[PDB]
């Protein structure tokens, strides 16, 4: 695996990122806190979004053009994608009332952190533009990268607004949980930043700035993003937290999950009433009742059939839109998403 | 007053900003929520930071160069400074546990908003870069403006970290409340975004990009920022909430206020013990005890003498560093700050 090898080399570069971001004695205490925020929240994941930048860069740039400075800028932009994700996740954990992430308690759940995590999240986002300035300022793709990260943040935030508006706390929202609504939330809240952003960053760094090539890449990557969020929704309830590193909250949070959308399409009038009575509530027995209904409607089997259909669809889109990019750019990512 | 006239003309342009930011039917609901966030949080203030952009622009640019498009870009950048402030304040109200702002309950205290305000704050920040792209993309100062707003956000966030680290909830922190600590917090948390950012934005728009001229402007503006935060700290306890539009929380939040720093410099060993026992706690009787101690040490009189000394100092800095900029750029702002 092209990711599995480059993984340890990627993590080894974190130490330099922290040193450069921690490099005015008056702000000493604030800088020591930023280092703590970085070390707790940006390290511990699979680093698939950040590694995608590095792997795509090595596949798109001519090896004679892959000098020490060029590769350093590639790893740094990969770490900017990981920082963007860390910004979103620190805040998403507060708004989703989550307990754990990447095998440890959520940063905001830590004694002595609490709602100060809001500012900590904003500092993580600020660090992206600090790194882009320090390493890419004199490059011709500088403005393209800045605008890509800003645009990806706007899209994600619009997606999170849709996610939160469809999931009001204390209100029965089954009418809102439609396939059309689900597809819009997922496109904006995760597909852009998770798949389009790292490949587009590598494309701009390789000097591929054409509107058509970015549109063709986006066509594959947004569909891959849709499947990744469906899988994330499935694992929220049916995944092993020792593997996922987090505890699911979608049922309690009244979320427009892929699971609830599939339930509503297959439920009898009686089964709809069970869902209405038990969904979007904090009671453990009500959550268990929803999971029992999902297993009764064979939703894990419906998911298994969907993964197969989605995989074939994404492969047909790679055949249609990959050119002139090497298909291996999209196949490597598809190998990581589909298990 | 050059601000008092241009105030109504500034507010009249908000309608266009909202229309352009609310201009894909799938994200309809999210866009309707963004409009609600903008209308609740960006309108209702004095608009002094946003007006500073417009007034400084008209004073720095030749009237023959002040065309309809140029002025439209000036009002828009003024509204970007107001959006940046709205982003910081929506989040600062959550972390300071505030109740009201600009005469109404804090956005997060609204029933049905709560911690979703975290995402709402992030959308306000995203809107800045949406407006810069839509109006300033083809201008030579585009990258300078983007970098100025990003740098101002980083500085402010570093300042807020320092503010929160010096004010731990549940801990007696009087040792930390020094003049040197206070001056660092204030420089970063408010002075850059409140005074340096709007003048620098107008300077870049007028084609004044020289390192020396920006350094000379900053020398005046950061000192003005220091006084504005001291006045804000004084009004937190001794101001009229019908005038300030907000309720003070500095004593309850264990903040390193200018007032507590002055108290600690003038307190007898007995008075220090009263402060230690009553500061940084939510009990109304303990807050009242701290205010009684402040009035006993004549801190409102100490503030009155400070405003006079600060005013003379800022005027001496205008005489020293204003040139070649018209002194009226700094005098107009000084007239607004000093009451
Ligand atoms: N997309 C952000 C984070 C998530 O994927 P996560 O499962 O919390 O990591 P969400 O389900 O809240 O959308
Ligand atoms: N500077 C941000 C907001 C304040 O000025 P405000 O008094 O809450 O408006 P703070 O005192 O929290 O610093
Ligand atoms: Mg979540
Ligand atoms: Mg979420
Ligand atoms: Mg999830
Ligand atoms: Mg405050
Ligand atoms: Mg504050
Ligand atoms: Mg205050």
Provide the CATH architecture of chain A. Orthogonal Bundle
Q: Give the percentage of residues in beta strands of chain A.
A: under 5%
Number of helices of chain A: 15
Q: Name the hetero compounds present.
A: pamidronate, magnesium ion
Cα distance, first to last residue of chain A?
14 Å
Q: Using only CA atoms, what is the Rg of chain A?
A: 21 Å
Binding site for dimethylallyl diphosphate (chains A, B): 101, 189-190, 229, 246, 255
Subunit structure (chains A, B): Homodimer. Interacts with RSAD2. (Microbial infection) Interacts with HTLV-1 protein p13(II).
Site (Important for determining product chain length) (chains A, B): 87-88
Family (chains A, B): Belongs to the FPP/GGPP synthase family.
Overall description:
Chains A, B: The modification N6-acetyllysine is found at residues 46, 276. Chains A, B: Its EC number is 2.5.1.10, 2.5.1.1. Chains A, B: Its cofactor is Mg(2+). Chains A, B: Belongs to the FPP/GGPP synthase family. Chains A, B: The modification N6-(2-hydroxyisobutyryl)lysine is found at residue 46. The structure is a homodimer of 339-residue chains. The first copy, chain A, is mainly alpha-helical. The first copy, chain A, has one domain (1-339): Farnesyl Diphosphate Synthase. Chain A has 15 helices and 2 strands. Chain A has helices at 2-12, 14-21, 28-41, 48-60, 68-95, 117-136, 142-166, 179-205, 211-238, 241-244, 258-266, 269-278, 284-296, 299-321, 328-337; strands spanning 100-101, 104-105. In chain A, strands 1-2 form a two-stranded antiparallel sheet. In chain A, a hairpin with a 2-residue loop joins strand 1 (100-101) and strand 2 (104-105). In chain A, helix 5 (68-95) packs antiparallel against helix 6, helix 5 packs antiparallel against helix 8 (179-205) and helix 9 runs antiparallel to helix 14 (299-321). The longest helix of chain A has 28 residues, at 68-95. The radius of gyration of chain A is 21 Å and the shape is globular. Chain A starts with a helix and ends with a helix. Chains A and B meet through helix 3, helix 5, helix 6, helix 7 and helix 8 of A and helix 3, helix 5, helix 6, helix 7 and helix 8 of B. Bound molecules: pamidronate (210) (2 copies) and magnesium ion (6 copies). One magnesium ion binds next to loops of chain B.
